[PDB]
Amino acid sequence: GDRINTVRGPITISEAGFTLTHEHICGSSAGFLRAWPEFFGSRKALAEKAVRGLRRARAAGVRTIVDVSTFDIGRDVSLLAEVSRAADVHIVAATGLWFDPPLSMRLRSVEELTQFFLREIQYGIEDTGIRAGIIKVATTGKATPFQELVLKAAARASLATGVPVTTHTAASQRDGEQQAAIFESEGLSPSRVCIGHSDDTDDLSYLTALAARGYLIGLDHIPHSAIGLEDNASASALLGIRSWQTRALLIKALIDQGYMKQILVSNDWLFGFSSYVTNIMDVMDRVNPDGMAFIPLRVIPFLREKGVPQETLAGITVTNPARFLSPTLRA
Amino acid sequence: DRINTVRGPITISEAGFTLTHEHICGSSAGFLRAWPEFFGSRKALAEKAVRGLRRARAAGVRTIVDVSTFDIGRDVSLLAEVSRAADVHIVAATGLWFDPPLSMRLRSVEELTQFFLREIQYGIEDTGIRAGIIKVATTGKATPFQELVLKAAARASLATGVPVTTHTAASQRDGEQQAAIFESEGLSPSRVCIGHSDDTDDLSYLTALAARGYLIGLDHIPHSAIGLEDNASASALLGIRSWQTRALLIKALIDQGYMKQILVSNDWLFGFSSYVTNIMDVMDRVNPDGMAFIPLRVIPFLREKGVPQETLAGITVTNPARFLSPTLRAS
Ligand SMILES: OCCc1ccccc1
Ligand SMILES: OCCc1ccccc1
Ligand SMILES: [Mn+2]
Ligand SMILES: [Mn+2]
Ligand SMILES: [Mn+2]
Ligand SMILES: [Mn+2]
Ligand code: NA
Ligand code: NA
């Protein structure tokens, strides 16, 4: 693969640069932003907030972000394109299905879902021509029957297009294993797959075993932590009580185990968030004022301090994402 | 003195013969725009709807109430386009059915009240097309979230005068619990239509609600799986009662003295993604008359059963007008 699709069109692999592989402009629901923009103040407000945030990550060195919002996460491709242009940051859009598919999606066959993911990757999202550059799927423990279909279609779409698959997992419950199993049963190469939210578990055995099989490990919840918000139940349930340092150390752990080439790091950040309790955005923003710039501003330096060499840091933030994102077909 | 339609306000007299429970398309939020090909094409769907609407219009139908909420995938722009092309008044709805995504399910009664008000008072999305009715629903005992929706719908009705219409599990007598919730909010039964009432032969249930002042929605008349007993999905959706059995409910209610509380419709559609693939073809085979079924078959049937002309006119013109007319409670 020589080109990556973005909301502004295709870019060469070199242009991706420093990339955050699991982010979001807005965490919502299909049709939500268009139907009730005031939930976020306004569309304009949300976009402005987004541009500010993207500009700041950009100042910090982020060149590209992969917005893993699916149809069901309320991905609004027009919004992504507008802010990408305004902030001058590349944004890779996604196809796939998250865990909140409406009936029209939930009643579909693997064949049907495959054609829909294909539509989004090959032709374009909605009527925009904006093509997806990644497939997002998810499980939250053992897969439901529908989710197994989603996983299968995702693999089929990946096999046909060469674009990678990235996932949401209930890390502590080892969902990556079931995911992998399904992917493999469809003939997908582990190298086209990123098992996400992997920093949510302290089980290094689980992660190294997956890495050992060739999977990419997404350590994408680094700044997520409710330490200092124990009183806030929902926030606690969302962010956990492990420190950012603890999560970040997993990156070092995997590097020390020999898997530096299989690590993807991000913040799983957003500018609007409707798919959870009201006011959770404010809470998050308090917890992590750096937002998407958290990786380059705090994690990179923390790792270097811990002994990780520059070249390794560079490989993880630049080389890894480039290899992953480059559309690659099975030989 | 005015009813809001997708083409603007109309005078109570312009509504004429009205179908109070219909859909242009039965889908999911954002589905039609993300995967129009599911219906062949957006253009195909529009044309189909225009043909059907022209045909019902030929039959005497002047207005249809499209009870598709945000979660049924209502696409007001499509409603407007087809209304204009077929020259049939179409009343849009707000409310929430039974497939709300997370962004909706996590909301409070207060937030949902503001969303329903936005759609009624200001406009749907950015179109300024104002909803003329509030659609809600339960499928058996209401869920906690569903109770909140019913309460918000009552609040919105009390503030705007726009009526509330519901989807029920007639079998389970959902209408009683709905009425309960509505009344606890101070809503007048005369602003409420208890839907899919013809799905049950319990004349006790129906007359008990009519007695309190509710409007009874006999809108599934043409739904019958007779002759397709072998199609599990269809029988499940359509039932095995004949259209005449359902229609006879109208006469029964008339006979029991509640002719002013009856609303009749077909609950038809031109696209249906929220169910198994091909259901639309099965339905169209069952009732080729589509929306025209009420005037072409239902009205004449009743008339032959002794129902008088003026009562027929009363039910099809008078009742809907009174129901649709925004009405604020006395103070
Ligand atoms: O040898 C290549 C150096 C590199 C480091 C970490 C991950 C990607 C590449
Ligand atoms: O005035 C009696 C005429 C009428 C009959 C049916 C429904 C509403 C009105
Ligand atoms: Mn996630
Ligand atoms: Mn995410
Ligand atoms: Mn219904
Ligand atoms: Mn309906
Ligand atoms: Na493509
Ligand atoms: Na209004």
Short descriptors:
binds sodium ion; six-stranded parallel β-sheet; EC 3.1.8.1 (chain A); plasmid (chain A); homodimer; three-stranded parallel β-sheet; Parathion hydrolase (chain A); metal-binding (chain A); zinc ion binding (chain A); alpha/beta; globular; 43% helix; 331 residues
Provide structural commentary.
The PDB classes it as hydrolase. Keywords: PTE, Hydrolase, Manganese. The assembly is dimeric. High resolution structure of the manganese-containing phosphotriesterase from pseudomonas diminuta. Chains A, B: phosphotriesterase. The organism of A, B is Brevundimonas diminuta. 2 copies of one chain form a homodimer. Chain A has 331 residues and is of the alpha/beta class. The first copy, chain A, has one domain (1-331): TIM Barrel (Alpha-Beta Barrel), CATH 3.20.20. Helix content of chain A is 43%, strand content 14%. Chain A is built from 13 helices and 13 strands. Chain A has helices spanning 32-35, 43-59, 77-87, 103-106, 110-123, 145-161, 175-185, 204-212, 233-239, 244-256, 280-287, 294-305, 310-325; strands at residues 3-6, 9-12, 19-23, 26-27, 64-67, 90-92, 94-96, 134-138, 165-168, 193-195, 216-219, 263-265, 272-273. In chain A, the strands form 4 sheets. A 6-stranded parallel β-sheet of chain A has the order 7-8-9-10-11-12. In chain A, strands 3-5-6 form a 3-stranded parallel β-sheet. A two-stranded antiparallel sheet of chain A has the order 1-2. In chain A, strand 10 (193-195), helix 8 and strand 11 form a beta-alpha-beta unit. In chain A, helix 2 (43-59) packs across helix 3 (77-87), helix 5 (110-123) crosses helix 6 (145-161) and helix 6 (145-161) packs across helix 7. The longest helix of chain A has 17 residues, at 43-59. The first copy, chain A, is globular and about 50 Å long. At the A-B interface, helix 1, helix 4 and helix 5 of A face helix 1, helix 4 and helix 5 of B. One manganese (II) ion binds at residues 21, 23, 67, 267 of chain B.
